[PDB]
């Protein structure tokens, strides 16, 4: 998550196919979810703290 | 022969359609 | 029933047989009988010399088969192998 590498927000990609999601908290661009924009970690946490509306702990 | 890309199954298992698996 | 390049398919529903030919496989087998107009199901031992010939005449004169195909393939296999073609360093590696 090198600050520099956090330049996805640099619209100008030269070729859209070069854009990539990146976490919006960890930077951890590995496995992010579009809906929230959260590095799978920076999501299970907020979802626990309760800062993610309706994001209830699933269960069936 | 699920794997045979050229038959009914082969397609299905591959989720594609072609000469051996028309649409309708 | 010598058909393509000295190929003698026999005893099974034609469409299946012509397949034993280097150059014929299900697809062209059908297409063969298709055009030639011969009940696919009919056995080879139960054909009409004429029928057989049309086939003989069509199959052979419609698709490069047997020794000629191989000829082409291997040749093609040298082809790129002749040039510093990587895909050609695969017929080595």
């Amino acid at each position: 998550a090198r600050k520099a590498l956090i330049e996805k927000a640099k619209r100008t990609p030269k070729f859209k196919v070069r854009a990539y999601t990146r976490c919006v908290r960890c930077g951890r661009a590995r496995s992010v979810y579009r809906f929230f924009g959260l590095c799978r970690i920076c999501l299970r946490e907020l979802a626990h703290k309760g800062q993610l509306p309706g994001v209830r702990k699933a269960s069936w | 022969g699920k794997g045979d890309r050229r038959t009914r199954r082969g397609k299905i298992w591959r989720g594609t359609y072609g000469k051996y698996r028309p649409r309708k | 029933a010598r058909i393509a390049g000295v190929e003698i398919p026999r005893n099974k529903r034609v469409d299946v047989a012509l397949t034993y030919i280097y150059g014929i496989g299900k697809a062209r087998a059908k297409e063969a009988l298709e055009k030639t107009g011969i009940n696919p199901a009919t056995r080879v031992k139960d054909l009409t010399e004429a029928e057989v010939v049309r086939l003989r005449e069509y199959v052979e004169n419609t698709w490069k088969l047997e020794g000629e195909l191989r000829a082409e393939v291997a040749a093609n296999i040298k082809r790129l192998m002749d040039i510093g073609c990587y895909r050609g360093l695969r017929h080595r590696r």
Binding site: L43, G54, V55, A58 | - | -
Partner: protein, 98 residues
């Protein structure tokens, strides 16, 4: 025939949400189409628990979208009255389609 479709992430603050639109209409317009349900779209999220390795853990997480429809038939002036400004739920989205 006022189609009042409600959607939200919570029911205890929806069924009420709608009921209001309901009884508040039972004093002017038609008896309304009552509060109808409608299937709920469940957004399931599966996320491995700790970071790094441990694939076999993962923790569940759902985000459900609740729906309703209400449906006020044959409106009558005094109808659009209370309905104008008399709600109290928060996380509820309302979209009307006459």
């Amino acid at each position: 025939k006022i189609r009042i479709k409600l959607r939200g992430f919570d029911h205890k603050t929806l069924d009420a949400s709608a009921q209001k639109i309901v009884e508040a209409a039972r004093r002017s317009g038609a008896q309304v189409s009552g509060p109808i349900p409608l299937p709920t779209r469940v957004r399931r999220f599966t996320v491995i628990r700790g970071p790094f390795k441990h694939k076999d853990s993962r923790e569940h997480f759902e985000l459900r979208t609740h729906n309703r429809l209400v449906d006020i038939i044959n409106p009558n002036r005094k109808t659009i009255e209370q309905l104008m400004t008399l709600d109290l739920p928060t996380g509820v989205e309302i979209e009307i389609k006459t």
